[PDB]
Amino acid sequence: AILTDRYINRGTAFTMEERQKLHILGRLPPVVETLEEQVARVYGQVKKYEKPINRYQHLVSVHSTNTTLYYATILAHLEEMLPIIYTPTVGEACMEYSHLFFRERGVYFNRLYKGQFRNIMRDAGYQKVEVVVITDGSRILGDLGSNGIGISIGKCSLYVAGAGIDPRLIVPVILDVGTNNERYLQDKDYLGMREKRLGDEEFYELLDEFMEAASAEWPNAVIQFEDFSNNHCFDIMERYQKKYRCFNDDIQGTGAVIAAGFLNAIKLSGVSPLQQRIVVFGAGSAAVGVANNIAALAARMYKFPVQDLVKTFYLVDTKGLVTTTRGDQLAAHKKLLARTDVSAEDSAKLRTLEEIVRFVKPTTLLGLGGVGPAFTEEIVKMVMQNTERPIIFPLSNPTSKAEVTPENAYKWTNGAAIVASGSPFPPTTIGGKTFKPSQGNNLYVFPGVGLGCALAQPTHIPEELLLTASESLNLLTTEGDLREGRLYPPLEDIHNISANVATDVILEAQRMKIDNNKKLPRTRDELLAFVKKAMWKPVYSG
Amino acid sequence: AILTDRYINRGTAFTMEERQKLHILGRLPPVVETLEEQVARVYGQVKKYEKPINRYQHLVSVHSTNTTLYYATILAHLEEMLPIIYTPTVGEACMEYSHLFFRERGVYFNRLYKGQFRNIMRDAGYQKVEVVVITDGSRILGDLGSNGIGISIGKCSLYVAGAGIDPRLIVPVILDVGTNNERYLQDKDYLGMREKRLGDEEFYELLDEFMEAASAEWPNAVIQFEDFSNNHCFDIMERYQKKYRCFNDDIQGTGAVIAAGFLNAIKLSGVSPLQQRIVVFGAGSAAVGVANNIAALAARMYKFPVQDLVKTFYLVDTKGLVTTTRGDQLAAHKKLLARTDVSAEDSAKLRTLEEIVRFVKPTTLLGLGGVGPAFTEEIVKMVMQNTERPIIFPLSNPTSKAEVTPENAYKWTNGAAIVASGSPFPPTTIGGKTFKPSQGNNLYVFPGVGLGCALAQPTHIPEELLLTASESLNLLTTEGDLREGRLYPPLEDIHNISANVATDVILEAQRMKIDNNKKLPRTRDELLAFVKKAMWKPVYSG
Ligand SMILES: O=C(Nc1cc(S(=O)(=O)Nc2ccc(OC(F)F)cc2)ccc1Cl)c1cc(F)cc(F)c1
Numbered sequence A, B: 001a002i003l004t005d006r007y008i009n010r011g012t013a014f015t016m017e018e019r020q021k022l023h024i025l026g027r028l029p030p031v032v033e034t035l036e037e038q039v040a041r042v043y044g045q046v047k048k049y050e051k052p053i054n055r056y057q058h059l060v061s062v063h064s065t066n067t068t069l070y071y072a073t074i075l076a077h078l079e080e081m082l083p084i085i086y087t088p089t090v091g092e093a094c095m096e097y098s099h100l101f102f103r104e105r106g107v108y109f110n111r112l113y114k115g116q117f118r119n120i121m122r123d124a125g126y127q128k129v130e131v132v133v134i135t136d137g138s139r140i141l142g143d144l145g146s147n148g149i150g151i152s153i154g155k156c157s158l159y160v161a162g163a164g165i166d167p168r169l170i171v172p173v174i175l176d177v178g179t180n181n182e183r184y185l186q187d188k189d190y191l192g193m194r195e196k197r198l199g200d201e202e203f204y205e206l207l208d209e210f211m212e213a214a215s216a217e218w219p220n221a222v223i224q225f226e227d228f229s230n231n232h233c234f235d236i237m238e239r240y241q242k243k244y245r246c247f248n249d250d251i252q253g254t255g256a257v258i259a260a261g262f263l264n265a266i267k268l269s270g271v272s273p274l275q276q277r278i279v280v281f282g283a284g285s286a287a288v289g290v291a292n293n294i295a296a297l298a299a300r301m302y303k304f305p306v307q308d309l310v311k312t313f314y315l316v317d318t319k320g321l322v323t324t325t326r327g328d329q330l331a332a333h334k335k336l337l338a339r340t341d342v343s344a345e346d347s348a349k350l351r352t353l354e355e356i357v358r359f360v361k362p363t364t365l366l367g368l369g370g371v372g373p374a375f376t377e378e379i380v381k382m383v384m385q386n387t388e389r390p391i392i393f394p395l396s397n398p399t400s401k402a403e404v405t406p407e408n409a410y411k412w413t414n415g416a417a418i419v420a421s422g423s424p425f426p427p428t429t430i431g432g433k434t435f436k437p438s439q440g441n442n443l444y445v446f447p448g449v450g451l452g453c454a455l456a457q458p459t460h461i462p463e464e465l466l467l468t469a470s471e472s473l474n475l476l477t478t479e480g481d482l483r484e485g486r487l488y489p490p491l492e493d494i495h496n497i498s499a500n501v502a503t504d505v506i507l508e509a510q511r512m513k514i515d516n517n518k519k520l521p522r523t524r525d526e527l528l529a530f531v532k533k534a535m536w537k538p539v540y541s542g
């Protein structure tokens, strides 16, 4: 009842006198370790596996035995563990090794349970739930169906590690509305709904029931949508954003993190926000959302007219530079960033990225294209003609889909390029000077939004709370971090980052009078201190 | 409290109506499987791992979630799983991956706990314990120290699978008396007693305390010694055999299994027991013990004078044929099987195995040598001169240390060789006729001895109970099994084998009046039926 409770079990960290007092003497080998020592031991155990999937499999077993030791190990090696415990290992574990998620507490919904969603939640037996991560396995970018539960599980664990959401107060959810994965539909071992994905009407009937049931049974929870397909993810936020406490990390988290890093890149370049000429390579709804979040943040931090900031952006879709004179009927999201200042004759000659870069003379390249390595040596050399400090953000993943490697960006600019990446890269050394890209990891924002929304209990999560989290992250990058060319505070300091982000999100909910928790301080120093004490810490407490 | 109890959890085998009644609807994906279906699914999950250690790691996770499903999967694929869940994977898991044993209920003794052994056992909180497996990690043949707990864990699991010892009524024990493994003594992550192995006096002080404490606190238990070094294993049985309910599977189990197979090989050869000329290649205490167990069994089943059976054996040590005229002072165990009928002049010319085989004209080669492939093509061709059906038992392991491969034995004899192995081998086909060696697996005997000693509660385990188990195993090989060239009943029928072995061991304890359980039937048909009902079965019961 001590050893077998993964929440209170300490394993070898039980002193000899504790083992005696708890009648577990002789249930453990005789060595007594501190948590630090146990973490070093577990880290060496992880590294005796070569494959990410087998390292994850080891970490699952640690979590099942000693939950405190699992979270202490992740926090001590966060940069290295992140790719094992979430993207991209988690999706490979869901797709081929879904059994690794079987022992993790989760909630499974489908049409068979229509009208029982509320009863199912009550029966799950949680106390004051703070965070719920829901997916349908459809994927923001391999349809996983029911096996998407592993995405919710991995994401919930990042709230616990990143912001000290208590691990008892977070719920991973799969809404199984079927799967278009043909292998799964024929697989004898697929345990989900063995049918193609429901149409929109039935999809919203079940997701409406989910939202309404959760708001009744888990009224203190933030509902975070994860890894929903583009046919639904934007429409879900339009349907629920005002009615329920909810956000989508893929859309809103991404834009908040990228905007924060990008404004710090502007500060380092010397080329001020109204002097930037920004090629946005990629014109999907998400890419335009990131551009708009950049504009919104620059407007908040600097009070430039947002219209003037919109005119710094040159949007490139699969046809070429998006302009009002190009001759096609533009998708709604592309109209706002369409150039009005380019002639029909010029638009016809602005198709290839190299000729667009030659014409626009950009100072920034934002890679949101999800195509090849489009930022060629020739394109980077042209940007060097327009600024002493090119900003180059190859943000498409996987690393193969990325517009340019940080190493190539630094080599071709002889260390001038200011780079943020979607993925971790090793440092690059040029002439004895070391350069390393700043990783725009989503972990910078969602945990702090979760912890802030958990504490403040806002009626909903308006765009003002995401913009505040974005600004808070930008302002955590110290003069020193900036002097060393970092665009973000260090990932390893995620607890301090989360507490600061949460504090600023709470102060914004307080300014809008949407906060329902009147116990919280209303001044930043006292609130920050209160938020730090509220966080769950992977240390042996009792 | 249902899902999280690995003893009552059924996972997807909970029907929709059970899930509703137990308030776990939505804690599982929607598919409902039978146990057979769950087993087929788990089997495919095992086989998506290439390495034995990662297959074992998967099976550990199954055992932690759904104990019934773990044991059902092992029994459905026993031949294939045995090398993963015990020798040789288990020793590799102990040596390099000891963390795979951390979550398994076990008891850890060392000198730090002197005089507290009884209190430690009471505190472990077991009910009417039936089987205890103890090791010191010294190895019958890489010193594992404390990591030897994994050997006890693996062996206990074979009692549960093989004889339906209830998994709640078995205890794995490590007596940590230190380690001479120099890597471990320097390893920061070794959790055991970081000192060289205790001398004999302190070793017996602690092992005496263990035996006396267990006999008081676990009075219904059989104590089985596993994987003790040769400096101690024989002396332990001399010290405890009459005083406590105990046996050593390496010594006594091996001899019982090999004797049973060997007598069936004699039946198939037509060359009757007094006409056999047996080369025993290898003259350690164990090898001589196997020869003596063969003699004892032939004397019991056929009432030949044991002296006449002893004269069928030609013992070969590292010097050559063991004889009274050779000129050396023979070790005690070698004297009994020493030839009296070979001259000093002949002994001097009986050194190499090829010249010994040429002189002795044996009909059997027993490989207990632990050296190379000593049974050469030339030696096998000579045995073909002496019998139409050579008996060739390459019993040394690993498979590299074996005296000859079954394939070579069958090829060189053109399918005449009668072969038993220490390890599983694929079938060999010669001229459209298929041959496959009979594996002398220890699983044939120890589980049935454990189940018989659990039921009968004998005051001790005299050699008569092992000889009875040996005979019982021999007699389970059906006329049909024999017509197909099998020396043992099929491994997959281990439950029936264990119930028969246990029944015969109980009837022998009853004949000697050492049985303490007066509830048992005293006639074979009624007792066999009673023993089958007593066994734990990996099926969903409630
Ligand atoms: O706490 C237990 N054992 C233990 C823990 C530790 S530890 O907690 O100090 N480290 C540890 C842990 C699990 C891990 O993961 C993967 F290997 F099991 C990795 C490291 C070390 C050594 C032992 Cl024997 C324990 C828990 C039970 F529920 C039942 C039981 F029988 C034992």
Ligand SMILES: O=C(Nc1cc(S(=O)(=O)Nc2ccc(OC(F)F)cc2)ccc1Cl)c1cc(F)cc(F)c1
Binding pocket: A099, A100, A101, A102, A103, A104, A105, A106, B003, B004, B005, B009, B010, B011, B012, B013, B027, B028, B029, B038, B042, B058, B061, B062, B063, B065, B066, B069
């Ligand atoms: O029973 C649980 N889950 C489950 C079981 C099964 S199963 O029992 O039918 N098969 C199964 C099992 C474990 C395995 O091993 C290795 F993968 F976990 C392999 C197969 C299938 C699918 C699910 Cl979600 C469960 C148990 C808990 F203690 C907590 C919890 F949240 C869920």
